[PDB]
Amino acid sequence: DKNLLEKWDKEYIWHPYTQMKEYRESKNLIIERGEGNYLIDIYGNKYLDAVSSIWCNLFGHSRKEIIEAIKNQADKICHSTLLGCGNVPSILLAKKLVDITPKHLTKVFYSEDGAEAVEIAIKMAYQYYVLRGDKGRTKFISVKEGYHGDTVGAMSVGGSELFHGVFKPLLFKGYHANPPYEMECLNEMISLIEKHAEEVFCVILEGGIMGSAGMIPYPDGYIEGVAKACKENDVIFILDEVATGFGRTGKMFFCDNEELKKLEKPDILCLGKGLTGGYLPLAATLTTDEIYNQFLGEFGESKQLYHGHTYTGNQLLCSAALATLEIFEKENVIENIQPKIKLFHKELRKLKELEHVGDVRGRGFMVGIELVKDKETKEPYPYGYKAGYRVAEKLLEKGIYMRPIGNVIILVPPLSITEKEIIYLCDALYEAIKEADL
């Protein structure tokens, strides 16, 4: 009963990232099923998933290989532990993950969410230095507006003042450079690394684009310059590819970068979201043997990483990821998305001419369109104006689901998006921006 579902949703669920007073007043999408690149609501209406269910869905909502891998695994066993035991799917997947990532990344620690992968990276980096005999390395370096998740460790190293600023008494402190967007901003970051090296246990950045800040790319050369500064100063470099990993930027991983490979950076890579093709929560933290080796010794020396929740390496999670990686290989996904990305960027250029479009930016299939009140001033709409949501409302009427962040329209379409869907998406966005009350 559709009216009951709507009522129960508003009565019983406290939704993530949502002002519930407004959600309870509106007619919200309630999804019942999915086919291809489309979410289907309880009214039977179809919406193109233009943000990939928040940046995780790679191949659509009815991809048979991943669905069948889950069902086949559930007929064997859904979960048994990695605490002092092993399980088959987690072993096969760990080999695949080591093999598809840079050669210096050789060890796999599993978790469920990108934020937990980052918490684990933080704890490994911190404890590495303690075990290695370093003293006083209790701080970190990151960037303003960076985002790594919403638990306390993730929030500490993030720079998301709006989301996490209220929690400052609970966060551990470090240093934040100005948003990365050679350039004055690289120089600023190198200077911070050089100044604070001996007091810091890591530098952490996202994989070449700041997602939650509104899909802003790091300038070319930026991550490579930071990595080299980390190497020159004996600081661990953590790259968070929770959103960028698995093809979204046009490469398999941002860190598939000859210069980073040459530097053997990052020392720690976090993965999540698209790892399972979007169907289940798995994440991974991959490290160098150098980091792993510090935690080796006799049991009674108490040097092991005392971390790991219940469902670490769960077989259903790992079965979805195995199927995902198998798709990558068998369908030559990275080569096959190249004409689609090229078409997407070509189809976005006309948005630049609209009166309320300040900036069109991003990398591959991760794009933001920044709305502005005045093109020449660059002046923003007030937060309370919900300019991006005004655009989202118009897109919904044209059969497209888009979630913005503040003034930034976000497009993170599935790798499976068709050329026709791309052309439709950008033509609909053009009209939507014109129809919105801006």
Residue type at position 54 = I
Would strands 200-206 and 139-143 be described as parallel, antiparallel, or unpaired?
A: parallel
User: Which 369-408 positions form the footprint of its own copies (CB under 8 A)?
Assistant: 382-386, 401, 403
Residue type at position 227 = A
The 10 Å CB-count burial string (b at 16+, else e) for 192-202 is: bbeebbeebbb
Gap between the Cα atoms of 101 and 245, Å rounded? 10
Q: Which stretch binds its own copies (CB under 8 A): 164-172, 214-222, 244-252, 257-265?
A: 164-172
Q: What, of Mg ion, its own copies, none, does residue 105 touch, CB below 5 to 8 Å by kind?
A: Mg ion
Told to check if 57 binds its own copies by CB under 8 A, we report yes
Judged by CB under 8 A, the residue of 143, 210, 317, 438 near its own copies is 317
280 closest CA partner among 107, 73, 437: 73
**Helix locations, 143-208, DSSP H:** 152-157, 161-164, 184-196
Q: What, of Mg ion, its own copies, none, does residue 403 touch, CB below 5 to 8 Å by kind?
A: its own copies
Q: Which stretch binds its own copies (CB under 8 A): 37-45, 180-188, 328-336, 416-424?
A: 37-45
Q: Residues comprising the binding site for pyridoxal 5'-phosphate?
A: 114-115, 240
Nearer to Mg ion, 297 or 339 (CB): 339
Told to check if 98 binds its own copies by CB under 8 A, we report yes
Q: Residues comprising the binding site for substrate?
A: 147, 273, 308, 403
Minimum distance from residue 228 beta carbon to its own copies (Å): 27
Tell the burial category of 300 from Cβ atoms under 10 Å away from its Cβ (0-12, 13-18, 19+).
exposed
Told to check if 74 binds its own copies by CB under 8 A, we report yes
x/- track of binding to Mg ion for residues 171-200 (CB under 5 A): ------------------------------
Told to check if 100 binds its own copies by CB under 8 A, we report no
Angle formed at CA 110 by CA 108 and CA 115, multiple of 5 degrees: 115
Told to check if 106 binds its own copies by CB under 8 A, we report yes
414, 57 in Cβ contact below 8 A?
yes
Structural element, H or E, at residue 312: none
End-to-end Cα distance, the chain: 37
Nearer to its own copies, 3 or 353 (CB): 3
Query: What letter does residue 415 receive in the DSSP assignment?
Result: T
Minimum distance from residue 101 beta carbon to Mg ion (Å): 4
388 closest CA partner among 399, 379, 380: 380
Length, in residues, of the chain: 438
Nearer to its own copies, 22 or 194 (CB): 22
Minimum distance from residue 41 beta carbon to its own copies (Å): 9
Which pair of tokens denotes residue 235? 């600081």
Told to check if 101 binds Mg ion by CB under 5 A, we report yes
Gap between the Cα atoms of 172 and 122, Å rounded? 11
Q: What, of its own copies, Mg ion, none, does residue 278 touch, CB below 5 to 8 Å by kind?
A: its own copies
Contacts of 430 (CB under 8 A, 6+ apart): 350, 351, 354
Site residue total, its own copies (CB under 8 A) = 131
Told to check if 30 binds its own copies by CB under 8 A, we report yes
Judged by CB under 8 A, the residue of 48, 59, 102, 109 near its own copies is 109
Judged by CB under 5 A, the residue of 48, 50, 105, 325 near Mg ion is 105
Q: Which stretch binds its own copies (CB under 8 A): 58-66, 254-262, 325-333, 372-380?
A: 58-66
Gap between the Cα atoms of 254 and 121, Å rounded? 18
Neighbours of 12 (CB within 10 A): 7
Minimum distance from residue 345 beta carbon to its own copies (Å): 25
Told to check if 281 binds its own copies by CB under 8 A, we report yes
Residues that bind Mg ion (CB under 5 A): 98, 101, 105
